[PDB]
């Protein structure tokens, strides 16, 4: 019954100084909060970095050290290195439950920086025949791994029947994701226009498929 | 060296219940407490409830005290976690993690995590459409919607376009997957030279070839 906030997504390259922070809605966060910081690598892997605030996990580099800033609990990375480009949450002890943030997606420059490839492909005609069309919207090689899909039929944000991929890392290190618009052999028909817009490290690529 | 096991997926019809296993080696069991948490792929970590394997005394979250039951059995280091009622709801991927309670308190070590699917589809082989384009090099993909279980192969005329392949992570809608794969070919070879993707689904016995067709 709180509520655990932390930034979406930070961006630092190697050798620099970056603080994650982890806020909870009731109040300060204080040492009773025991705030523990938990760290998400690709594969479903899980590594616990502090707990008590400032306790930092045994074989967890000295780069990372916890501590309140204010109000909030704070991760430090000093020297940030490219191994510590993953996802990391927080969580927060309240007398008797845990409450973990939404997760920060960290990205530590390993390379430059990398725009996405934007392809939409409109129902195809064997589709429309199951009285259903799926639109299909693909995005691969962007970096960092972190990017905004938005669809737009007839001018109007599409707000349901649009699902996207968790961004899966590629070979190459960039990553690739994609957004499916399912409508109904139907809409498909009734529609004009279809949008598929991605913002990607404060640029927008806006692929439109005109029906 | 401390570990914490885990089976890899399970796959339960809605209406029943899963009895998920966490294995503990490399420490004194008892000495620590053992936490279960719930991740559905992109929205976040949920606390289930924890375990003392000592006395057996658990803590849960309001929100899972109908839903979980953790139980322990020290004699084979195991923690274990029922679910109960289950429904295609209920598929993520669920953790066991060891709290050092009595020392300093962190979630040090992890499961590698148990991913549940809860469906009541029986093996369906996928429908494979084609994905060409409508306006240097030019990409083509192909859909394959509607499958179970996982996986499905994809591959581009039976390999030789074998760079410059993506294949997309899979979505569980309404008890079915759906995939996606394209390839980049110079806007020579398309469409003078076909393009065919080639699915192919194992638990179903299939294989489906596309030719892409301009259109
Ligand atoms: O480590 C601490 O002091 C915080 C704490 C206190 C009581 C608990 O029951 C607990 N837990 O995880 O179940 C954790």
């Known amino acids: 019954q709180a509520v655990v906030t932390q930034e979406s997504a930070l961006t630092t390259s190697p050798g620099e100084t970056v603080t994650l922070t982890c806020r909870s809605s009731?109040?300060?966060?204080?040492?009773?909060?025991?705030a523990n910081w938990v760290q998400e690598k690709p594969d479903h892997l899980f590594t616990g970095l502090i707990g008590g605030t400032n306790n930092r996990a045994p074989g967890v580099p000295a780069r990372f050290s916890g501590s309140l800033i204010g109000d909030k609990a704070a991760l430090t990375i000093t020297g940030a290195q490219t191994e510590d480009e993953a996802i990391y949450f927080c969580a927060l002890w309240y007398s008797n439950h845990w409450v973990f943030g939404g997760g920060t997606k960290l990205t530590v420059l390993g390379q430059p920086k990398s725009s996405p490839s934007v392809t939409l492909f409109p129902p195809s005609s064997e589709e429309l025949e199951t009285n259903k069309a799926t639109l299909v919207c693909t995005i691969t090689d962007f970096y960092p791994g972190v990017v905004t899909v938005d669809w737009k039929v007839d001018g109007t944000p599409v707000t349901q029947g649009m699902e996207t991929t968790q961004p899966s890392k590629q070979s190459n290190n960039k990553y690739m994701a994609s957004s499916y618009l399912t409508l109904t052999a139907r809409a498909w028909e009734r529609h004009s226009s279809y949008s598929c817009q991605v913002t990607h490290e404060g640029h927008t690529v806006e692929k439109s498929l005109s029906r | 060296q401390v570990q914490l096991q885990q089976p890899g997926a399970e796959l339960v019809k809605p209406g029943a219940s899963v009895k998920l296993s966490c294995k503990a080696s490399?420490?004194?069991?008892?000495?620590?407490?053992m936490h279960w948490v719930k991740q559905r792929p992109g929205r976040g970590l949920e606390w289930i409830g924890r375990?003392?394997?000592?006395?057996?005394?658990?803590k849960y979250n309001e929100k899972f005290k109908s839903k979980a039951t953790l139980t322990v059995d020290k004699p084979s280091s195991t923690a274990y976690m029922q679910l109960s009622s289950l429904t295609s709801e209920d598929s993520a991927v669920y953790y066991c993690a060891r709290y050092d309670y009595y020392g300093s308190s962190y979630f040090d070590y992890w499961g590698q995590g148990t991913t549940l699917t809860v469906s009541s589809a029986k093996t369906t082989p996928p429908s494979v459409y084609p994905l060409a384009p409508g306006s240097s090099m030019v990409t083509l993909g192909c859909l394959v919607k509607g499958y179970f279980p996982e996986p499905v192969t994809v591959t581009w005329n039976s390999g030789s376009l074998s760079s410059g392949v993506h294949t997309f992570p899979a979505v569980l809608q309404s008890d079915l997957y759906t995939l996606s794969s394209s390839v980049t070919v110079p806007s020579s070879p398309w469409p003078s030279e076909t393009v065919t993707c080639n699915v192919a689904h194992p638990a179903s016995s299939t294989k489906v070839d596309k030719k892409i067709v301009p259109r």
């Open positions: 375990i003392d394997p000592n006395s057996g005394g658990t």
């Open positions: 009731t109040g300060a966060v204080t040492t009773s909060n025991y």
């Open positions: 490399g420490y004194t069991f008892t000495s620590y407490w």
